[PDB]
Amino acid sequence: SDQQLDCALDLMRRLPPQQIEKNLSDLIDLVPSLCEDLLSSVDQPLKIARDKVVGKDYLLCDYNRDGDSYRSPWSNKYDPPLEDGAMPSARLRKLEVEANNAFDQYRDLYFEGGVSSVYLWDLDHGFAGVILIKKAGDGSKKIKGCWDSIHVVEVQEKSSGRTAHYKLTSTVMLWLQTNKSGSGTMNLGGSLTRQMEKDETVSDCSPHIANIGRLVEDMENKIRSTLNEIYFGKTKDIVNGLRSVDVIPDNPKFQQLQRELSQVLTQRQI
Amino acid sequence: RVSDEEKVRIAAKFITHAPPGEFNEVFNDVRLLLNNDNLLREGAAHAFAQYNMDQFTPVKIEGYEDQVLITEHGDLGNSRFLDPRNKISFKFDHLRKEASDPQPEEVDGSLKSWRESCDSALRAYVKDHYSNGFCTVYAKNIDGQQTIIACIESHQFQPKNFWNGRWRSEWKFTITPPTAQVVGVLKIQVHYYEDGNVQLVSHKDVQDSVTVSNEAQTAKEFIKIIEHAENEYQTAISENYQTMSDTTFKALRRQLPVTRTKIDWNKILSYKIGK
Amino acid sequence: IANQPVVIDNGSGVIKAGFAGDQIPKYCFPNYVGRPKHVRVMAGALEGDIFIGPKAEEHRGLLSIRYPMEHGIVKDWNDMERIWQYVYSKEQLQTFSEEHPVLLTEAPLNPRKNRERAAEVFFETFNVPALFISMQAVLSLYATGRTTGVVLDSGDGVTHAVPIYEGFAMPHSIMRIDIAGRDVSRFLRLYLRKEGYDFHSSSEFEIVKAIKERACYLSINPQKDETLETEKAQYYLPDGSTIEIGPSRFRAPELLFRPDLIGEESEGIHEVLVFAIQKSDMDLRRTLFSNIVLSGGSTLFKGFGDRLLSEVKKLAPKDVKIRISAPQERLYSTWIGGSILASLDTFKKMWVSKKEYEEDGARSIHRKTF
Ligand SMILES: Nc1ncnc2c1ncn2[C@@H]1O[C@H](COP(=O)(O)OP(=O)(O)O)[C@@H](O)[C@H]1O
């Protein structure tokens, strides 16, 4: 059954990432014994939650959730209301409020839409956060699309010197639909994950969350540019290489260029 | 406890919609998942039939020296498929890679003879579009109507590279004098799975009206329609996405902010907005 | 008509020219058209009123300098025609355009309309017998004597990392930016105004290029240089007045690695180099890492190659042998390769003849290049 989990993860890596929720539910139907293993291991699109007391949307993960209920980052309360939920420390809660506010301004500048959520769970040696974002594209347009963040960070605070070992694990779950130009409609689904670790000295001017943020900004600019290329580097060579009309006239030229390069090869040496 | 009938339906959805580079692996993944073989092996055999028809993939029959695509138009109905070029029936085994034990077929083929001249032409143009290209031009009567059904594909699979590009083309040409009617769908699929996944999924539905004149003309007219459509398609598929995806993917999330300055974290944590 | 062919290596900053089968380009001069600002009162003044090359360099202060070509894309076509006419004229080459075949160069992945209009100029206005446009990276490898390897380059207009493996220039793996020496010179000019010493004039713009060429260095750790206070070194201008440069000298060439500082989204030189290696096939990546060739003027900063090596070590997979090689004459790397390519007997087959252009048109030029 360890091979079954390996196959289950291999299957979700090959099926469309647009239908993770439906396929994961069916995969749990087919293997009910792996339900707990698959829900933890298989990454899926983030759920929308609504805080009724504040009147604001928050996002749901395994880390912020304790049992059936999920701590809202705005009110600090779980829905449904649990008696003794796993809350953070009063210092970490104040830090968590400042994280939410900081990453609220983060998202709103990069996307200018959607919803985010930030939750920080208390550790003895550190403070570890999750930064969720979900932005939806223009619904009226034929081109649908969304962008989803799952930045999990682990900060190991050192005792002396005020330095902090950060460990960022960032997933980016994308699905671009393209229905335009009167030539057909294409739907592209991406899912790259990148890891980054760093030790930064703590400043009194800028808190530790700002140090975390700097990793997110740099990671997102790089992951995005990496993603961007893995799209083209494959959608270009593979599709063009299959059905290129200019392949057959250039093949005759390449064969001429093969004689030519061979003549160049001898002449370059001497 | 999930019922045995529920297990087969879950297996069917994955096998019916699997990426063709790894679909035979997906079947192996479904089989390596559920313990017993017979329940999936029996259910997959039906799925493979429907699945291998929608791929337009050719099984090489041992002694033909060419590749005959398989579809709904070649389906005789008795688990054997037509090869309209070489004009022999073949039984296609769906688990195993090969199709063997063929049977010579003989039909009057009056509608079928006309299109086989147009077919042998199409091939030469398929060879022009792709480095490796295989086809099948089915000849059939559909509820009294007279219809050529050319199909083209391309399979480019490599295990080490982790990328797989696959083309399938569906083309139906109904013969009616003078004016004829055409219906065709054109699907691309590419999949990259290194350090995480990326998929290209596509199609173009085209409705066209053609007029029959000569055998040389009808052979070179339909091909011309395909040539221009598939180029315009690839052109748009390559040239729009390299630029427009970059801008639409950017319209969702921008590479830098509206200021074009990396956001200052010190600014965020000690500034107030509004009124 | 197979005379000794001419190699006009184009470029936004500098334009090289000369004959085939030569060691160095004899005719190098900056690619711009100087025109007189002031009113010519006195008789017996500078005649012509359109200055190109060494006359324009000699008489900077009179002339309002303007560049015809930005980011490997000509804006003013009349200016480039005058430059090409000056190249062929008696003041530089001492030849006719009708005699010799032409080898042109351009940056990769440019607009095709500019390539067509370039060919129109060579075939119609000049009466060229045969034309051939080529890549810069392909030539630079022919100059060195290798076939395999990536070519990172940095001129005044374009920075592009082209991977090649045994005479197979992958058109798809070519990365490119519109960020280069001109943008670094513009960013240094902006920093000098923040320091105090403002330069706004077009003749005065070339003093900023001269300061950028001479007094600049790329630090390995930029955060460490930001924390430390600079020494504020001096430099004498063409006039005589001294200028304390300050922290502008080291923060100016950071634009190439951090493109966010000017205010435009791009990858960067070090990212582009990693990105060109990644887009190619898995088996060819380790050979591409081992052979990395440098070229252009904006690779000549102090500690540039050392910073590139550190950036590759950070991004690339671990336990891989990195080697960023470079020639002695980095400025004339592309032209030497063209002179070698032109001297070869194969060159006759590749070119676009004037008869072939008159028959077909632009389609034949698009086919022969790729
Ligand atoms: N020693 C140097 N240090 C820094 N920058 C230089 C140096 N020499 C030249 N440059 C810059 O590089 C440019 C010349 O590059 P070049 O490769 O000739 O451009 P192109 O590729 O367009 O011909 C000049 O415009 C100048 O700004």
Short mmCIF file of all heavy atoms in Angstrom, two decimals, chain C residues 125-166:
data_model
loop_
_atom_site.label_atom_id
_atom_site.label_comp_id
_atom_site.label_asym_id
_atom_site.label_seq_id
_atom_site.Cartn_x
_atom_site.Cartn_y
_atom_site.Cartn_z
N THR C 125 18.40 50.80 -52.95
CA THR C 125 19.10 52.10 -52.84
C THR C 125 20.58 51.92 -53.16
O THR C 125 21.13 52.62 -54.02
CB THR C 125 18.94 52.75 -51.44
OG1 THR C 125 19.56 51.94 -50.44
CG2 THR C 125 17.47 52.96 -51.10
N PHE C 126 21.22 50.99 -52.46
CA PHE C 126 22.50 50.42 -52.89
C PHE C 126 22.16 49.33 -53.89
O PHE C 126 21.06 48.78 -53.85
CB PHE C 126 23.29 49.83 -51.71
CG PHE C 126 23.51 50.79 -50.58
CD1 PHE C 126 22.79 50.68 -49.39
CD2 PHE C 126 24.46 51.81 -50.68
CE1 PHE C 126 22.99 51.56 -48.34
CE2 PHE C 126 24.67 52.70 -49.64
CZ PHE C 126 23.94 52.57 -48.46
N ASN C 127 23.09 49.02 -54.80
CA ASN C 127 22.88 47.98 -55.81
C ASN C 127 23.73 46.74 -55.50
O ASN C 127 24.63 46.38 -56.26
CB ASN C 127 23.16 48.53 -57.22
CG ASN C 127 22.10 49.52 -57.69
OD1 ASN C 127 21.43 50.17 -56.89
ND2 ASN C 127 21.94 49.62 -59.01
N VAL C 128 23.41 46.10 -54.38
CA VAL C 128 24.16 44.94 -53.88
C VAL C 128 23.96 43.71 -54.77
O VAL C 128 22.83 43.42 -55.17
CB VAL C 128 23.76 44.62 -52.41
CG1 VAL C 128 24.21 43.23 -51.97
CG2 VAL C 128 24.32 45.67 -51.47
N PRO C 129 25.06 42.98 -55.10
CA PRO C 129 24.92 41.74 -55.87
C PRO C 129 24.31 40.58 -55.07
O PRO C 129 23.51 39.82 -55.61
CB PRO C 129 26.36 41.42 -56.29
CG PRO C 129 27.22 42.09 -55.29
CD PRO C 129 26.48 43.31 -54.84
N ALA C 130 24.70 40.44 -53.80
CA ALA C 130 24.14 39.41 -52.91
C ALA C 130 24.21 39.82 -51.44
O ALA C 130 25.22 40.37 -50.99
CB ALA C 130 24.87 38.09 -53.13
N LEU C 131 23.13 39.54 -50.70
CA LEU C 131 23.00 39.89 -49.28
C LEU C 131 22.84 38.63 -48.43
O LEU C 131 22.34 37.61 -48.91
CB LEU C 131 21.77 40.79 -49.09
CG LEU C 131 21.47 41.36 -47.70
CD1 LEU C 131 22.55 42.34 -47.27
CD2 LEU C 131 20.10 42.02 -47.68
N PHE C 132 23.28 38.71 -47.17
CA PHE C 132 23.08 37.62 -46.21
C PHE C 132 23.07 38.14 -44.77
O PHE C 132 24.07 38.68 -44.29
CB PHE C 132 24.17 36.55 -46.37
CG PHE C 132 24.08 35.43 -45.36
CD1 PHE C 132 22.93 34.66 -45.25
CD2 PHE C 132 25.15 35.15 -44.50
CE1 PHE C 132 22.84 33.63 -44.32
CE2 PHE C 132 25.07 34.13 -43.57
CZ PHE C 132 23.91 33.36 -43.48
N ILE C 133 21.92 37.98 -44.10
CA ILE C 133 21.75 38.36 -42.70
C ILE C 133 22.02 37.12 -41.84
O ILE C 133 21.66 36.00 -42.21
CB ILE C 133 20.34 38.91 -42.42
CG1 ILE C 133 20.01 40.07 -43.38
CG2 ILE C 133 20.22 39.39 -40.98
CD1 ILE C 133 18.55 40.44 -43.44
N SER C 134 22.66 37.33 -40.68
CA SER C 134 23.07 36.23 -39.79
C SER C 134 22.99 36.63 -38.32
O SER C 134 22.77 37.80 -37.99
CB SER C 134 24.50 35.80 -40.14
OG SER C 134 25.43 36.85 -39.92
N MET C 135 23.19 35.64 -37.44
CA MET C 135 23.14 35.85 -35.99
C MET C 135 24.50 36.34 -35.49
O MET C 135 25.51 36.20 -36.18
CB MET C 135 22.75 34.55 -35.26
CG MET C 135 21.64 33.73 -35.89
SD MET C 135 20.29 34.68 -36.62
CE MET C 135 19.62 35.49 -35.17
N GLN C 136 24.50 36.90 -34.29
CA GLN C 136 25.74 37.35 -33.63
C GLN C 136 26.42 36.20 -32.87
O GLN C 136 27.64 36.08 -32.90
CB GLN C 136 25.46 38.51 -32.68
CG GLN C 136 25.01 39.78 -33.38
CD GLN C 136 24.86 40.97 -32.43
OE1 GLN C 136 25.63 41.12 -31.48
NE2 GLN C 136 23.87 41.82 -32.70
N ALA C 137 25.61 35.39 -32.19
CA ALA C 137 26.10 34.24 -31.43
C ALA C 137 26.77 33.17 -32.29
O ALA C 137 27.79 32.59 -31.90
CB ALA C 137 24.97 33.61 -30.63
N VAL C 138 26.19 32.90 -33.46
CA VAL C 138 26.74 31.92 -34.42
C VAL C 138 28.14 32.36 -34.90
O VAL C 138 29.05 31.53 -34.99
CB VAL C 138 25.79 31.71 -35.63
CG1 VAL C 138 26.45 30.87 -36.72
CG2 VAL C 138 24.49 31.06 -35.18
N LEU C 139 28.28 33.65 -35.18
CA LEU C 139 29.56 34.22 -35.63
C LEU C 139 30.63 34.18 -34.52
O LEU C 139 31.76 33.75 -34.77
CB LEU C 139 29.38 35.66 -36.14
CG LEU C 139 28.95 35.86 -37.61
CD1 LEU C 139 27.93 34.83 -38.08
CD2 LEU C 139 28.43 37.28 -37.82
N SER C 140 30.26 34.60 -33.31
CA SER C 140 31.19 34.60 -32.17
C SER C 140 31.80 33.22 -31.87
O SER C 140 32.96 33.14 -31.49
CB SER C 140 30.48 35.12 -30.91
OG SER C 140 29.43 34.26 -30.54
N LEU C 141 31.01 32.16 -32.05
CA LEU C 141 31.51 30.79 -31.93
C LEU C 141 32.47 30.42 -33.06
O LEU C 141 33.46 29.72 -32.82
CB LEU C 141 30.36 29.77 -31.86
CG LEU C 141 29.44 29.79 -30.63
CD1 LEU C 141 28.48 28.61 -30.69
CD2 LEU C 141 30.21 29.77 -29.32
N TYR C 142 32.18 30.87 -34.29
CA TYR C 142 33.11 30.70 -35.42
C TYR C 142 34.43 31.46 -35.22
O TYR C 142 35.48 31.01 -35.69
CB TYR C 142 32.47 31.13 -36.76
CG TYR C 142 31.40 30.19 -37.31
CD1 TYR C 142 30.20 30.69 -37.81
CD2 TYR C 142 31.61 28.81 -37.35
CE1 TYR C 142 29.22 29.83 -38.32
CE2 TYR C 142 30.64 27.95 -37.85
CZ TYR C 142 29.45 28.47 -38.34
OH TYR C 142 28.49 27.62 -38.85
N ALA C 143 34.37 32.61 -34.54
CA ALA C 143 35.57 33.39 -34.20
C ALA C 143 36.47 32.68 -33.18
O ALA C 143 37.69 32.65 -33.34
CB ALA C 143 35.18 34.76 -33.68
N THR C 144 35.85 32.11 -32.14
CA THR C 144 36.58 31.36 -31.11
C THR C 144 37.16 30.05 -31.63
O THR C 144 38.30 29.70 -31.32
CB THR C 144 35.69 31.04 -29.89
OG1 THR C 144 34.49 30.38 -30.33
CG2 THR C 144 35.32 32.31 -29.13
N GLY C 145 36.37 29.33 -32.43
CA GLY C 145 36.75 28.02 -32.96
C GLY C 145 36.01 26.84 -32.35
O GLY C 145 36.38 25.68 -32.60
N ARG C 146 34.99 27.11 -31.53
CA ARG C 146 34.10 26.07 -30.99
C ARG C 146 32.82 25.98 -31.81
O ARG C 146 32.48 26.90 -32.56
CB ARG C 146 33.74 26.37 -29.54
CG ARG C 146 34.91 26.41 -28.58
CD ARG C 146 34.44 26.81 -27.19
NE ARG C 146 35.55 26.99 -26.25
CZ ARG C 146 35.43 27.41 -24.98
NH1 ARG C 146 34.23 27.69 -24.47
NH2 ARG C 146 36.51 27.54 -24.22
N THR C 147 32.13 24.86 -31.67
CA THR C 147 30.79 24.66 -32.23
C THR C 147 29.73 24.63 -31.12
O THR C 147 28.72 25.32 -31.21
CB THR C 147 30.70 23.35 -33.03
OG1 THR C 147 31.04 22.24 -32.19
CG2 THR C 147 31.64 23.38 -34.22
N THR C 148 29.98 23.83 -30.08
CA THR C 148 29.10 23.74 -28.92
C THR C 148 29.30 24.94 -27.98
O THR C 148 30.39 25.51 -27.92
CB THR C 148 29.35 22.45 -28.11
OG1 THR C 148 30.73 22.38 -27.72
CG2 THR C 148 29.01 21.22 -28.94
N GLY C 149 28.23 25.30 -27.25
CA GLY C 149 28.30 26.30 -26.19
C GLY C 149 27.28 27.42 -26.29
O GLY C 149 26.76 27.71 -27.37
N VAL C 150 27.00 28.04 -25.14
CA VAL C 150 26.11 29.21 -25.06
C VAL C 150 26.93 30.47 -25.32
O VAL C 150 28.11 30.53 -24.96
CB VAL C 150 25.42 29.32 -23.67
CG1 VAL C 150 24.47 30.51 -23.61
CG2 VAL C 150 24.67 28.04 -23.33
N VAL C 151 26.30 31.47 -25.93
CA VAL C 151 26.91 32.78 -26.14
C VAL C 151 26.06 33.85 -25.45
O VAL C 151 25.04 34.29 -25.99
CB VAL C 151 27.05 33.12 -27.64
CG1 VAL C 151 27.67 34.50 -27.83
CG2 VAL C 151 27.89 32.06 -28.35
N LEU C 152 26.49 34.25 -24.26
CA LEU C 152 25.96 35.44 -23.60
C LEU C 152 26.64 36.64 -24.23
O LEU C 152 27.86 36.64 -24.41
CB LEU C 152 26.22 35.39 -22.09
CG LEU C 152 25.54 36.41 -21.15
CD1 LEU C 152 26.28 37.75 -21.10
CD2 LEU C 152 24.07 36.62 -21.50
N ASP C 153 25.86 37.66 -24.59
CA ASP C 153 26.39 38.90 -25.15
C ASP C 153 25.71 40.11 -24.53
O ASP C 153 24.60 40.00 -24.00
CB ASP C 153 26.28 38.93 -26.69
CG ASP C 153 24.91 38.49 -27.19
OD1 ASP C 153 23.89 39.05 -26.74
OD2 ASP C 153 24.87 37.59 -28.06
N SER C 154 26.39 41.25 -24.56
CA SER C 154 25.85 42.50 -24.01
C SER C 154 26.44 43.71 -24.73
O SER C 154 27.50 44.23 -24.35
CB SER C 154 26.12 42.58 -22.50
OG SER C 154 25.72 41.40 -21.83
N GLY C 155 25.75 44.15 -25.78
CA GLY C 155 26.11 45.37 -26.50
C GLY C 155 25.49 46.58 -25.85
O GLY C 155 25.31 46.62 -24.62
N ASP C 156 25.16 47.58 -26.66
CA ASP C 156 24.49 48.80 -26.20
C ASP C 156 22.96 48.67 -26.26
O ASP C 156 22.26 49.35 -25.51
CB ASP C 156 24.96 50.00 -27.03
CG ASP C 156 24.82 51.33 -26.29
OD1 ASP C 156 25.23 51.41 -25.11
OD2 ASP C 156 24.32 52.29 -26.91
N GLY C 157 22.45 47.81 -27.15
CA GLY C 157 21.00 47.64 -27.36
C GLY C 157 20.41 46.40 -26.72
O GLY C 157 19.49 46.50 -25.91
N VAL C 158 20.95 45.23 -27.09
CA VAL C 158 20.35 43.93 -26.73
C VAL C 158 21.30 43.07 -25.90
O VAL C 158 22.52 43.12 -26.07
CB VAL C 158 19.94 43.13 -27.99
CG1 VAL C 158 18.89 42.07 -27.65
CG2 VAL C 158 19.40 44.05 -29.07
N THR C 159 20.71 42.28 -25.00
CA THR C 159 21.39 41.19 -24.30
C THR C 159 20.63 39.90 -24.58
O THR C 159 19.44 39.81 -24.27
CB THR C 159 21.42 41.42 -22.77
OG1 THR C 159 20.10 41.75 -22.32
CG2 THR C 159 22.37 42.55 -22.40
N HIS C 160 21.31 38.91 -25.18
CA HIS C 160 20.67 37.63 -25.54
C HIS C 160 21.60 36.42 -25.38
O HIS C 160 22.74 36.45 -25.85
CB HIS C 160 20.10 37.69 -26.96
CG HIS C 160 21.08 38.14 -28.00
ND1 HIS C 160 21.28 39.46 -28.31
CD2 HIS C 160 21.89 37.43 -28.82
CE1 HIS C 160 22.19 39.56 -29.27
NE2 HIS C 160 22.58 38.34 -29.60
N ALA C 161 21.09 35.38 -24.73
CA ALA C 161 21.83 34.12 -24.51
C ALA C 161 21.35 33.06 -25.49
O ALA C 161 20.26 32.49 -25.32
CB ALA C 161 21.65 33.64 -23.08
N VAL C 162 22.16 32.79 -26.52
CA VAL C 162 21.83 31.82 -27.57
C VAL C 162 22.62 30.53 -27.33
O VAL C 162 23.85 30.55 -27.38
CB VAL C 162 22.19 32.38 -28.97
CG1 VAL C 162 21.87 31.37 -30.07
CG2 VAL C 162 21.48 33.70 -29.22
N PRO C 163 21.91 29.40 -27.08
CA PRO C 163 22.58 28.10 -26.95
C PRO C 163 22.73 27.39 -28.30
O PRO C 163 21.77 27.32 -29.07
CB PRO C 163 21.64 27.32 -26.04
CG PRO C 163 20.29 27.86 -26.36
CD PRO C 163 20.47 29.29 -26.81
N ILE C 164 23.94 26.89 -28.58
CA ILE C 164 24.25 26.16 -29.82
C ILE C 164 25.01 24.88 -29.45
O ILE C 164 25.84 24.89 -28.54
CB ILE C 164 25.08 27.03 -30.80
CG1 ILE C 164 24.41 28.40 -30.99
CG2 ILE C 164 25.25 26.30 -32.14
CD1 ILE C 164 25.06 29.32 -32.01
N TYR C 165 24.71 23.79 -30.16
CA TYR C 165 25.34 22.48 -29.92
C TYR C 165 25.69 21.78 -31.24
O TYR C 165 24.83 21.16 -31.87
CB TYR C 165 24.42 21.60 -29.07
CG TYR C 165 25.03 20.27 -28.68
CD1 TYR C 165 25.93 20.17 -27.61
CD2 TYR C 165 24.71 19.10 -29.38
CE1 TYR C 165 26.49 18.95 -27.26
CE2 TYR C 165 25.27 17.88 -29.03
CZ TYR C 165 26.16 17.81 -27.97
OH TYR C 165 26.71 16.60 -27.62
N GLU C 166 26.96 21.89 -31.65
CA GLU C 166 27.51 21.23 -32.85
C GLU C 166 26.84 21.71 -34.15
O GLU C 166 26.46 20.90 -35.00
CB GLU C 166 27.45 19.70 -32.72
CG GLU C 166 28.10 19.15 -31.46
CD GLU C 166 28.25 17.64 -31.48
OE1 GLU C 166 27.41 16.95 -32.10
OE2 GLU C 166 29.21 17.13 -30.87
#
